[model samples]
Target: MVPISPIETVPVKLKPGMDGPKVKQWPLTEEKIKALVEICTEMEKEGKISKIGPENPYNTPVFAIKKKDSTKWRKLVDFRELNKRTQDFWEVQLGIPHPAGLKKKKSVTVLDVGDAYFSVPLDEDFRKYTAFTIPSINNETPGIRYQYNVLPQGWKGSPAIFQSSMTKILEPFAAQNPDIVIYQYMDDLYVGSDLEIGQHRTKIEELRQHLLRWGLTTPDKKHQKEPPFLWMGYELHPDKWTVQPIVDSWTVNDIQKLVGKLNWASQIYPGIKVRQLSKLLRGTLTEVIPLTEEAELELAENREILKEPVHGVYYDPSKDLIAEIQKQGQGQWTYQIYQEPFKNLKTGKYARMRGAHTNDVKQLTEAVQKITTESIVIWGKTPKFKLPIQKETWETWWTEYWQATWIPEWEFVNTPPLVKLWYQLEKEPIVGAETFYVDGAANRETKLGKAGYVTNKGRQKVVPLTNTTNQKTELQAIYLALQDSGLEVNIVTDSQYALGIIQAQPDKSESELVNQIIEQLIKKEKVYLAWVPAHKGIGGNEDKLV
Candidate 1:
């Protein structure tokens, strides 16, 4: 337990001009009061806490917070007032290396120290600042008050002080034993090495003895194994690592923790772009944004991205010159460029690669091969196509199809003045109609849109827009559906942008893809765009895959 000696230290105080008082009394049942008494008694027996008279200047309230998914509970001292006056003197000295940067290792071990915080002694005078009151045992007598004799869990400086003490104890072993790395989070110690089997075991044994010498005790619950794959809240395999939440089940607090972990993951995995996940992080675990299907779907999509191999270097245009890399195979490796292929460019040449001289290409090749590609650079325009069909042919077909089919025509009809019929006319039977479903998605975080289209014939595809705006994606989706087949295809979408764009071309706001769509309509003659409110009870909207 933390030592209690007479050492003059700054007394903890509330914020300036603020008075210390019992903030609120948290009600407790008999069973809860019993549990609290038992815990305090156990700590007292261990000399980790001390009973105090009602003369202390500071007296904070205490409350019980349940552990996740269990009946187990712990008391929390309401030190928010005191925390404002406490200046943090301790710094976090530990570092957790990313799994990507870890060197190959043969064995791993985890160390769990029992009552780690209690192991650190507290300053005798400062101890009284932690004084907190608990409910009466049977509601017949006044409540008892106590102060922690050791570093308590909820105190502001407890973690920092414990960390500093542990770092002091572990620094010698870390320095002397160069091969072994000791990572400490609170009381848990993770010891691992990239050394060979014989050497690694020797280091582990030496460290075990070292820890023993410092009065550190490791319980039998700790493990020694190969690729221990889990530590703290991080899970790792050979290929990847992810932050695992503390509990299998989540409460609002757990979800809040998840938001932080997800943000950390985003920074580490730079190449993996998750726009929706970014958007999802904007809200808290509170009532308005309680778990929803859209949020769940967003999580599911990000999880899929997490499973993929963490490869692919982000492209930097300024540094690199001419680039050329071969597609290794179908799914094994592929490459993507931001610019259109050379043949597709109006210049009909490799525009950017032209800037790269012979030597730059050689250097580019060397750099591309060093790291895993998607396994490779291409600034070239030669519109290369490894698709099922040739790119030039599709381009030519669309170009010609647009010109030959689309021509403007006008039909005028004059209304007859108020002619009334006595009998109702029979409706004509429907014939030869095609149905198409279109959906466009835009990220509020990124402001980018993506399109999904499905035809009655079971043909479905997704198109990514070069432009970030959703309006372009909405307009382009209709064109994607009408690219081929459909004299009278009925296009259904939820976007008002799609509906408005279909009705009229805004002045100076037309896009190339939109122009192609207009051409397709002129030739197809009877294509129609219809509006269906999104996620409403409409047929085919749910069945159609996006």
Candidate 2:
């Protein structure tokens, strides 16, 4: 394991469209550590801790450690051990609630105390209250700040101490770059516009030199990636906190922790499904779900679950109980135990064999083999793709083609906007191109017995499409706007981009629309179709067009 320095600095970069791993390996050098310690020693003489005011009676002082130029002692303390024990500790806001909030909150700045660090102190009796323990830089001796009524390693107050002091240091830069947004949470730094990328980079460069002025060593380029940084477990952006997918595979210990978390979450949000979560935590242990007589009867009429299987495990119009079982079994078992109306002994629940079980576990052997010729397997015959049978069913064909990737935006909208909504689709920027835009409410125009009105820059009024006669009126508006512009005419509308069908593609209907505009374009100089990214906010045209 790499030894964490008093300050662990990671660098990041920003390529307009790049979004990937937030944490990249930052090379650690002994020279870097030595340089950092030198800065810390100087900061100590200035009494950095004394500069910070108390938040509550318990607010602890931020500490500084003097590193021996010759000796190897360079560990920092987690001072938070003392802060929590204070009477009635409340978090101080950096700024006032109103625009002219308190001086402590409004004038908050950031400092890089090289030797300064954080801690969660132990309780009074000095016997560690919880399993959580944060060992300081000195490996041989565990942190003792909390033992003598000091701060603990995991105390919530620890971050406040580090953050406030750091805020004090960065205060000057905030004054200098009034246009940039600076957010410091403990050792973490986030700067941007509404958190825009350009503003984020501008603030980072400004911050780099500011730390240098204070003798603090900033991480090299290798440390940062795609701008922004992941401090603690939070993936913070200039403007917001975004979450990333878990990179590590779930271990046995993870599942145990998750089970504990789920139990609490279920109680908190009763609206979210509880049984499925419960089954996920403990479902694998059972081969058969123990159902009450009433549950068995409630599950009896769920023959539609056997009506047809979708990809082996999925069934539509399913009983609540049966759906929960499949969700729990997914990815763990090769097949799921589906209970249908079986003409068996006393119980009405029958097992429908959908797929094979990967496990050699013996308890479910009887259930797996129970299915006979009369048994219903909706997709029982298997990957049979007949064009006529498949052609009529657009859903299957769509799934097959869509799986290959990158469907044109225009094609997507016309095919079924409602389908996209049903799938809970999200509209985000696409790769390579400047952007891909989706205007869902565009269909809300006056065509389908709906009243539509436009707001200012947020939404502009577009004249409702009246008839083929009105086509020329719309074309004339575009032509009139571009009449004297020196730039070559390559007018683009979101209709082609969002709907996946280009008007210039030479359909008979397109020609008719063109004929209506023919006299106008001939009256003007030139016009052509061009494509560009829609919603990425990369260029002025996109912003102006909107």
Candidate 3:
């Protein structure tokens, strides 16, 4: 265990409404007592724990489990009491790219450090909280108690603490280099690719040396070459550059384990088809997911999905100073891009790229070029050659524009009052209308219903709207009437809600529907919105609806 001296102990924060309690100890067998003693004695020798000399309010129970097919024992602790009270401070964002996408890399290496949990020292005052009593057996003293001097295994925060320490050490190096890709999941570090050959070795050695300087040691047997690059429980093939679950077989108990394995793959490749099965198996043990033939078939499909090549690279603008590409997806196929860094005239957010039949690839490539050339700093993930731009990226772009000095003057328009009003309402009558009557009807179950409009062209407009509210449908019906009427037309509707939306400022409070209507209306210079009473013997009242 590497001891980072002058380190602050992790403060145990109790969850809200939780008070410290006297937790009962579980029954211990003679064999278990001996195992606990053996494990604690070794840890004490390593200065990871010390004997509890005084009475401590915080104490947790301990037990032991034998290693499979071996007499050696591993100590286990019941830290549920401590864990419930411990506030989680782990904020490391984990988004390790799938190894299959590292096609540009010549070599990949994985490193596992020894005694990872013990590397982090515990606070002097809080050490007593990790105290566990082991019954003295076979020439041992009675009621022997010891507390952890360092972060111990089986605690909730151990892995997080280790990750934080490891990240703090390696992040600087990662920032200094663009070619090298280093990812740490807990104490395990996987280094992939460097600009120069043997430089990857140098980078790994630098990490190892840093850890060595800090009193940490990497295990020899755990380090492996490319053929079997064991990382996060997945065994990667160096030659083929693919990874798969390491276990030989699985049972119902291992369903979650399998789900986790598949879930990681799904994150890297959103197009994976086995996600449904993965979600099905991901639940409490009480919830049973029958592995029928189809389920088994889906699980088997994960093998192919893992082998599928990634379509694009993901670049997270928040973490990296330079927009460096992380992984490459399908290089040949073009992708339709949306929610770009500029406000889209259609979406009312960022600019979107609508690709023609063969334009997908070039549009994305151009967007990347623009982003790089402009040094557009974005606090969002930009993975190229991927399908569907993430909504979060659009939101980030929206915020950046809102706060930045640069206004999208090029996209903004100045028009006449009538045109501006029409644009704000986003209403362009589908057909030319001199005067038109519009009505819409909807209910709770079917949130959106049929919208009907009548124009000089006769009862010409009736369309069904899905996933819309009654108010929106009413406004849409008015829009349809305007679109169907002539440019200089009067649109009549009995819906007060629709009329309110039309009169309200476009920016004050609006939905996409409002914007769409406004955009359409702006094209027509003269269109009057008239409110009429419903169920009154008006000519268009029969066509008007709620």
Candidate 4:
């Protein structure tokens, strides 16, 4: 293992709430004992660990496992307590994009570093807690104690800590280039591109120097520049990928760990079709997933499915960003978009293209506009597409907007916002010699729904719909209240959605409906759509609207 210094001088701080009793070492065989002290001295001289007083309260046992009958041994430590009591902090977001979506490049490269845990630095303030006891060579001498001055593996947050600190060191470098796509999952790094030949190698060299200057080493042997690039345990091929780990699960603990692996696999591999994961999801021996008949069968089925390779298809970046609308049965309209354009990991956004707050928002808006205005259905061969203005609204939303069983905004004289009342009770209703109250409500499971409105003329108008959403019903109630009269009326609604749609016109149709409410204001100069608390038990609201 190479002794690498931290790229940053920040002292590693102990994660909080870590007090624990010393867990003593188990007995070692004569051969194992010799190997233990031998490796200990080698590590000591190398400064991986150094002499410490036996009084350190946080000591944990360290032991060795022989490599074989051969004269070699592997050092192992009992980190049970170190992992158990260290409170929290395992979350740090980093991209692990499905390589399938990223295969759009001419070249892809990968690099895996050695001893990532040891590369991180820790100081005495945090070191004494990781002290371990060393057995004496013989009865004549006292045992020496040592502590780690570097990050330790097998602890609860080792990967998280390594991923975070390394990511921090690379942040500035990543910021300098906004178009290069570099992906880091723990100690591994991968970059993909649409650039010309050998350009990815240039990119990789610049990255290599970036890590080399820091303490991490990316050896020439570790550089994977060709196809069948090995990453994240998946074999990335020109046209497919395949299954990876095994050694069947044993205990509930083992089963739990296995489930985590399958869970991650399920995300990247849509080939995972098992539906009864609830079988694996819920309890053990040797700690019993008890291997109940159903669980065993489910896992058996999953194993069979995984053995088959998952084929890949070309992924077009522009083609992937999309906005889609579909109608089920007759007139219930629904919409789902590549919500990526509508959202981001958070702000400044962490890359799918380039991270570092740059181009994050620009990329998303640019993506959204492209999807909304540019995408089409015949999509070359067959990728479904639709919009309000299509070869038809009879099958499209524009016409469906009219046929909707609920009253629509074009039917309203006025649909103004009622912000004067933002509470669940009183003062929400306008004393209508010209008053109206409208509300929209729907339960998706309850296929048909309706809403209500009360006119000051003392005739309470409760409108019903064959199919509507909470927002649609709320919009209809406002229109229902003003159905026949083109007057400056105060319309009360309990929905913020309709009010906002009225305040700011939506980009697209129910948007078609909301915009009509706006045109009423443009032409008739009268309206209101707004906020009132639902069911406050007031006599005026007693019929229980919406």
Specify the poorest-scoring 10-residue window by lDDT in model 2: 97-106
lDDT of 3: 0.56
Per-residue lDDT of model 4, residues 59-81, tens digit only: 78888887788768888887787
Estimate the overall C-alpha local distance difference test score of candidate 1.
0.53
State each model's CA lDDT, in order: 0.53, 0.31, 0.56, 0.54
True-structure RMSD, every candidate: 19.9, 28.4, 11.3, 13.9
Which sections of candidate 4 miss by over 4 Å?
A: 1-6, 9-18, 68-71, 93-96, 137-140, 230-233, 238-310, 320-546
Question: Cα lDDT for residue 348, model 3?
Answer: 7
TM, every model:
0.46, 0.26, 0.54, 0.51
lDDT of 2 by residue, 1-546 (tens): 533223322121222342211121123344544444454445445433112222212222223334657644443433333323322333565532111011111112233333334221223332222111222343454322221222334444445545544566678788877766566544545444434555554566667766655445555355344424443333433222322222233344444454444332221111122233333345343233343244334224332332331111122222321101111122221122222322110111123233322211111222223221112232231111111111223344244332332111111112211111011111332222221111212222432211122211233233333332322333433433334322334343333422232222211122444433333444533344344554554222321211
So what's the TM-score on candidate 2?
Answer: 0.26
lDDT of 3 by residue, 1-546 (tens): 655444445666557776654565676788888678777788889888888866776668887778988978888888888887776675664554443234335666778774656767776766766778776565356577788888877777777777766666667677876677886665677677835657766777777776766667775444665465555444555433323433423455557666555544543343344334554555445345565556566546556655655322323233322221211222221112223331110100012233211122233334445443333322233333222333343343334332322211111112211111113222454345366778887777867577877765565678887776677778778768766655676788888888766554342123566666666676776776778887796776653243
Model 3 segments beyond 4 Å from truth? Answer: 1-21, 94-103, 136-141, 167-182, 192-207, 220-222, 225-492, 496-546
List ranges where model 1 is wrong by over 4 Å: 1-21, 64-74, 89-96, 137-139, 194-199, 225-228, 231-234, 238-546
Name the best candidate (by TM-score).
Answer: 3
